Symmetry: D3
Subunit: 237 residues, 6 copies
């Protein structure tokens, strides 16, 4: 066990799906996994392990922000033998052609956090996903008839940023979605030699002011989860 | 009422105690307050309001890391009229004479986060607590016969820091505890015009490697809670 | 014509292969393209246009370093209608298992240049390639039976860096090759709305000290050229 | 002796009051101390040692700016055994409701200087005063019927800053006064293990351009000196 | 030989003139040198060695940008024994009193590149020319009837900069000309113990929008080369 | 008058010599100038105006550090019509062949201060002296038979720097002397449109540990003073 995860080696599968909300992790375990059992509840950050189409899968919340998800992902890798992490979250869009409920895959993640500069001698570390994991997700999405855009995400430290101008810069550079964790997960994956991918569903649009309701959530949330789970099966080959 | 808090104006008292762990907030509510009622459960980040010696007080978790706590403290201040925030957390110690379970009060908070540089045109913003709140905490600790050191905390973005050398620098400069939120809360308090204070209980010693369990952190660091609650009464006059 | 390219709209194909060495561009034009004609010679930066299996394609040098290649790629995009740029370069390796003449595909590019910070409000811009172009290159490589690793490159401003320790950091983070332009080309592609990809052939090993001669770099790194050209045909389909 | 102070161990008391102006130090020595003797005059930076209500005390100018006062305070601490340093100076106000003659106590000090980043591995060091010294000054002021605000000062490197908008940022974040030394003295105190405090009199208002009368400066200047001296007696017990 | 220069010790004189355009290097060798021999052609970066008034002198292009010229100047110094480097290039002017065709001598070079910060522990390194070389070029110009202006150049990384405001800052601070290499060459010269100088002819004016005629380009280019060559003879005395 | 200089337009000559020590300014006025009159004594920062061989000249202290001298030089330029400023100071040497009492002229000045980054959009501003003034000082030294090296100075914010390794870097890059003001004076001169020069006499050797006394620094570094004064006369003709 660790100070944040009260479990032991073996309680987690080698692949873990991670939404930011622990309550969504419970929803995933009960809705998509069979024989799911709770393997962690320290700080209410619920984690479960079950099977999907016979394959052992774990799902656990990671909390909001780079510092929060960096703790859980590092521990899962070094203390629980996890090889692959797939964040399945929500994000806001800044591009006019990116619509509410669209699925976006972060091949890369920009950030205003200082964590990768601390790791990389203050130079620019391109926080990227594992290529095969990205391709697997794109193919699974295609199989399910869901188009997914692949590109850069922006992982913000401040949900309430005092710099309103940054959103225009993000739009100019083609950022597909604004969230708060991808760059941190990719930094941890690179630091400890694991593989990661972040998939998000657009839950709010910064330009149109649109927002998903309770219902709109579960529906598009389900598509992203199916993409993630099926992408794992393609990955096993 | 807000994106991360499902409650309405009036559900929260004007003073809110905030541990990072929502289960610690639950324990505090069940053990130190009378007639506590749950006022938030979005994302499992439990928040409660009850009374302490007749005084209305709230307690709610803020999650781990500057990004997470910045969201919750900003929302409490701008949408729930919260005036004072007392963070009651845990921290790792680097100084040889600071022991496990000692209580430290952060009059200031250093950080390796970039959030205050973003707010302060890339200059050095001294993230500090409200002086009267610090004094009330010191006086309450004295009345309770509990030792408490007052000084600088260090708010890290990375619990698992790749820069071990930084701990030697922290020790040289007299840092009392290493945690992950104080500088962020102090930044939000100055940005939106409220008052804050961070009190921590040492949960680990970075040099000796001694540490407390997840269960101990969740429910046994009570000296700091008594100090926090009694300091509020002093502040009321 | 632009200030660095004496050619007219229509002289370049919509896709341009770009080595840093104009003499390598000449070699490519003479041996892989049919009916190639020279379309630029300003500053000796030779550019050509011809056909590959019936497909119109251009090849032009970009010089060494981010500043040099940023000028040429910007002009090709804004003034010559170029849509896709495939850099075909060389790089030094730091990983023990990467060998001389291995082909590496840069899905992302780290850098110690300040150009992307100037573009991105001093935050971390993840300089990435276009996903479809990366996938097309990976598929073309498999079809040709050529191994190719996909990952991060490091675009350095100083070939003769005084910071020897940075190579250990690169190694630790899995950097596939050290070169000098990828991050700059990806920055320009994002700023002006085009698509880019960098493929490199390992020309030196920074740890073992093995290296190829200038003649070898100029005319014998052909696997990457075959991959690049075939990846274009895949993209047209 | 050092290249900056022509004196020997023993010439200075364990507590030193330091105005920026050496002529102000002479004024304090002749007006508030008894049996005052000049102990330094190198570079005209006058320093005196005498007694106040039987307590041995020294008073010496520190010059203008962080680099100047960092030299004097460091030497006093390491070569003359000084334990406590109290800077007594002037500052400009940016807050509309802070008025001339007001006394401000710098519990913390922001800065645009690079000195603390050099000490603290380029992270944010919260330059803070010693808590007991702050408390002692607050109590002394109250005993004298003088009200005093406690908060953040901003220590500027450029009195004639080309960045006028920074004053608006300072105002937004509640900076009580703009001066040029506090952050530097607090950094030295922490580096060499001593205790420090900065007390300032608002000598001018940056917005109203209203400067305090050279007539009313002397009376309040005296208020500040009294608070400082009396605060030292409280600290002794 | 090196990967960038196919020549051997002895092939280059102790003094090398360097325009950015290799074709300009060929022109100089053919027009001003006696018995010029081509000594390098790798990557088309033409280098020649001949004599001027009996003095052995080399001329070779350096390519565009700091990273390109940093490679060549470093190698010339450490592997070919070059002692003095004189860059002869073009620059854009921002000052109203600096005119098209004026000759500017960069006694210093500002830059937005990160290379000198990498060399100088992230502090400000003043990239300067060798004083005697500056003096010799001023005197040579006077003897030829030309009044060169001596001052700061600005070496940009981005010819197509997204920061339009920087030109106004350059003007305010007296920058004589904008080019892309001087600061890099001065950094290499200081790093490896050689002497350097950059002389430029104003080829375009950012404010008046003037542009040098192809005819004006050749006549002025010639005056600059004469100044450079004659300055070398003064330095030998 | 200003809050730092109690004088009016006309009290200062158009050329001002400035040592950091006001007592050295007094010694210079009493020894080299005829009919010197005191024109400022605020904060004990003595300034005088007199004649040298019939030429009106002023001499005034500027205090220690960039912040201190930036105040005085700015005021002299804007409020007192000063056109040229010659700093005559002391510095520590790091090079083996630079000896105590050697005279060095700072053609340029590196720095670890943030003031020029604040002025120059966080890029590298090369803080340089006026070329003609440098030439006049070199010629004056020659005529007087005094040796003088011309090169880079390093202007430090911390006399007692915690980064000892920086001296090795300075030595590697050819720094002639370590002082604390040149870069700041050069920045002010460029910002307000005046001309400046820094000449220093080596007062300590950082490697051999040899050093001069406070008394020697105050009154015996006269060679640099003769060079400075005679350089002004050369500049007038
Ligand atoms: C502008 N819109 C948005 N901005 C920033 N983060 C988010 C998010 C995600 O949801 C949580 C914040 O509510 C975080 O965990 C983040 O990843 N959704 N919509 C967002
Ligand atoms: N407005 C103002 N801005 C900056 N510093 C000061 C000061 C203080 O007085 C001196 C500059 O006048 C410095 O030592 C500084 O601490 N007073 N009023 C100030
Ligand atoms: C605003 N005007 C200008 N801006 C930047 N560089 C240049 C140059 C020089 O010419 C080449 C770029 O065309 C570079 O090698 C550079 O030194 N000339 N005019 C310039
Ligand atoms: C190095 N370190 C960093 N943070 C903490 C903490 C605090 O507890 C949570 C992480 O365990 C965070 O919310 C942080 O503030 N406790 N002990 C810590 C330690 N040793
Ligand atoms: C350390 N290092 C840096 N760049 C390169 C390169 C590439 O080839 C040119 C320099 O040789 C540049 O254009 C760069 O991209 N090849 N081998 C390299 C090496 N070992
Ligand atoms: C390391 N170091 C730094 N500054 C100085 C100085 C100069 O003299 C004063 C400090 O002694 C400052 O004004 C500074 O310019 N002299 N010798 C120095 C030395 N060895």
């Amino acid at each position: 066990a660790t100070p944040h995860i009260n479990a032991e080696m073996g309680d987690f599968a080698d692949v873990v799906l991670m939404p930011g909300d622990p309550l969504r992790a419970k929803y995933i375990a009960e809705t998509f996994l069979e024989d799911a059992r709770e393997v962690n509840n320290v700080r209410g950050m619920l984690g479960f392990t079950g099977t999907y189409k016979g394959r052992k899968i774990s799902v656990m919340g990671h909390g909001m922000g780079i510092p929060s998800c960096s703790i859980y992902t590092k521990e899962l890798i070094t203390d629980f033998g996890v090889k692959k992490i797939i964040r399945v979250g929500s994000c806001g869009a800044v591009l006019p052609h990116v619509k509410l409920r669209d699925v976006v895959i972060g091949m890369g993640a920009c950030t205003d956090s200082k964590v990768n500069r601390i790791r990389f001698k203050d130079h620019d570390f391109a926080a990227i996903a594992d290529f095969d994991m990205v391709r697997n997700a794109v193919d699974a999405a295609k199989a399910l008839g869901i188009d997914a855009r692949v590109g850069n995400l922006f992982s913000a430290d401040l949900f309430y940023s005092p710099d309103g101008e940054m959103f225009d810069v993000m739009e100019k550079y083609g950022i597909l979605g604004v969230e708060m964790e991808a760059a941190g997960i990719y930094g941890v994956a690179a630091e400890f030699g694991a593989k990661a991918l972040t998939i998000c569903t657009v839950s709010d649009h910064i330009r149109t002011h649109e927002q998903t309701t309770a219902a709109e959530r579960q529906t598009t949330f389900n598509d992203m989860i199916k993409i993630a789970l099926e992408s794992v099966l393609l990955g096993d080959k």
